[PDB]
């Protein structure tokens, strides 16, 4: 056994670095703490233990994370929900983990809401633009809401009509160019887009099992988009855009069918051109991943440590 909370949500980030790509993955432990595990290049995963707590949230809190580089180092933001269902934020400010300012706004979320977040523009010489996506209601047909950071937090848009407690994936495919993926009331994955001055319904859609967990990534100038969804104990699916949308396909290992446990979640990260990780929760209870190795294909990578309870 491990200290990984069964049906914990997961969030993950990645950035390229001279010694090998840096990854961080966030997950909840049995005590409600949010833990971090770390990977540098292809070196074994580290962290994931009681010594790697970055914050706390309500048990079974949704999670989302973004990162950028600033003049003060690596910035990370981890979004979660407290025990009063207030949207909250933990900040890695380049040196330490602290509580961010979002919590003080007092944004109320639906108890079963998922979370997604994206960022663009932040650098050594430019401020970040963050968008956090959540829902206020657990009911079927509810909208997705957006919180906006540009120098301060303000309410953003609301759109869509979703499956109850829909999964949400969010990616900035270019500067101020946003794609949000969610499950509609008819269980289709749908796409909401912002290019310049308005939200509009995108051309992407895909039938999926009710209650899938959804992630989305993008890279490059093409741009390239990947949308992932998975129902626990079913296989992972990927839709790919590089100018058109393909027919979605399963990512799977014939020797290890349907490795995720029921009612679990996924997260994705990416960096370079291109490395991708798609995290999932399996027997153990283990934090696993699918990895795309750029010229080899998909495989299940090294298991991410998530603690070992006393007496084991």
Ligand X SMILES: C[C@@H]1O[C@H](O)[C@@H](O)[C@H](O)[C@@H]1O
The residues of the shown chain that bind its own copies, judged by CB under 8 A, are: 1, 3, 5-7, 30-32, 58-61, 81-85, 111, 261-263, 283, 285, 309-312
Residue with tokens 């299940």: 300
* Stretch 145-174: interaction string toward ligand X, x if CB under 6 A: -x-xx------xx-----------------
The residue within the footprint of ligand FUC, chosen from 54, 57, 80, 102 (CB under 6 A), is: 102
Residue with tokens 């509609």: 184
Distance from C-alpha of 267 to C-alpha of 289, rounded to nearest angstrom? 9
Find the shortest distance in angstroms from Cβ 95 to ligand X. 9
In terms of residues, how long is the chain? 312
Distance from C-alpha of 33 to C-alpha of 190, rounded to nearest angstrom? 32
Q: Which CB atom, from 30 or from 53, has the smaller least distance to ligand X?
A: 53
Find the shortest distance in angstroms from Cβ 149 to ligand X. 5
204 binds, among ligand FUC, its own copies, ligand X, none (CB under 5 to 8 A by kind): ligand FUC
Q: Identify the CA nearest to 311 among candidates 5, 46, 2.
A: 2
190 binds, among ligand X, ligand FUC, its own copies, none (CB under 5 to 8 A by kind): none
- Applying CB under 6 A, the span of 2-10, 78-86, 108-116, 142-150 interacting with ligand X comes to 142-150
Distance from C-alpha of 285 to C-alpha of 254, rounded to nearest angstrom? 21
Distance from C-alpha of 266 to C-alpha of 68, rounded to nearest angstrom? 22
Site membership for ligand X, residue 105 (CB under 6 A): no
What Cα–Cα distance (Å) separates residue 75 from each residue in 78, 80, 123, 149? 10, 17, 10, 14
* Stretch 221-260: interaction string toward ligand FUC, x if CB under 6 A: --------------------x-------------------
Q: Which CB atom, from 56 or from 89, has the smaller least distance to ligand X?
A: 89
Find the shortest distance in angstroms from Cβ 104 to ligand FUC. 9
What Cα–Cα distance (Å) separates residue 230 from each residue in 19, 135, 140, 207, 243? 32, 20, 20, 12, 24
Find the shortest distance in angstroms from Cβ 59 to its own copies. 4
Site membership for ligand X, residue 53 (CB under 6 A): no
What Cα–Cα distance (Å) separates residue 264 from each residue in 11, 64, 177, 293? 13, 15, 30, 24
Distance from C-alpha of 103 to C-alpha of 285, rounded to nearest angstrom? 31
The residue within the footprint of ligand X, chosen from 17, 139, 274, 293 (CB under 6 A), is: 274
Residues 148-207 binding ligand FUC (CB under 6 A) are 149, 173, 179, 191, 193, 202-204
Buried b (16+ CB within 10 A) or exposed e, 161-186: ebbbbbbbbbbbbeeeebbbbbbbbe
Catalog residues that contact ligand FUC under the rule CB under 6 A: 77, 89, 91, 100-102, 128, 149, 173, 179, 191, 193, 202-204, 241
Annotated binding site for alpha-L-fucose: 77, 89, 101, 153, 179, 191, 203, 245
């Amino acid at each position: 056994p491990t200290e990984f909370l069964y049906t914990s949500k997961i969030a993950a980030i990645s950035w390229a670095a001279t010694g090998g790509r840096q990854q961080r993955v966030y997950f909840q432990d049995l005590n409600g703490k949010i833990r971090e595990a770390q990977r540098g290049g292809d070196n074994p995963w580290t962290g994931g233990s009681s010594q790697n707590v970055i914050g706390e949230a309500k048990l079974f809190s949704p999670l989302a994370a973004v990162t950028w580089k600033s003049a003060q180092g690596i910035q990370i933001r981890v979004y979660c929900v407290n025990k009063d269902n207030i949207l909250s934020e933990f900040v890695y400010d380049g040196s330490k983990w602290i509580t961010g300012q979002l919590g003080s706004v007092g944004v109320k979320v639906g108890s079963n809401s998922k979370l997604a977040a994206l960022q663009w523009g932040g650098s050594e010489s430019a401020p970040p633009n963050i968008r956090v996506y959540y829902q206020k209601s657990n009911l079927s047909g509810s909208s997705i809401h957006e919180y906006v950071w540009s120098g301060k937090w303000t309410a953003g848009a609301s759109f869509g009509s979703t499956a109850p407690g829909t999964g949400i994936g969010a990616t900035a495919i270019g500067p101020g160019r946003l794609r949000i993926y969610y499950q509609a009331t008819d269980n289709k994955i749908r796409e909401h887009c912002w290019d310049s001055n308005s939200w509009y319904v995108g051309g992407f859609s895909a039938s999926a099992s009710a209650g899938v967990s959804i992630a989305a990534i993008s890279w490059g100038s093409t741009p390239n988009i990947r949308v992932y969804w998975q129902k626990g104990r079913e296989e992972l699916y990927e839709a790919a855009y590089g100018g058109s949308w393909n027919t979605p396909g399963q990512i799977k290992d014939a020797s290890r069918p349907t490795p995720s446990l029921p009612d679990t979640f996924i997260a994705a990260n990416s960096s370079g051109n291109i490395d991708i990780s798609v995290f999932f929760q399996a027997s153990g209870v283990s934090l696993q991943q699918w990895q795309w190795i750029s010229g080899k294909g998909w495989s299940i990578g090294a298991v991410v440590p998530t603690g070992t309870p006393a007496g084991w």
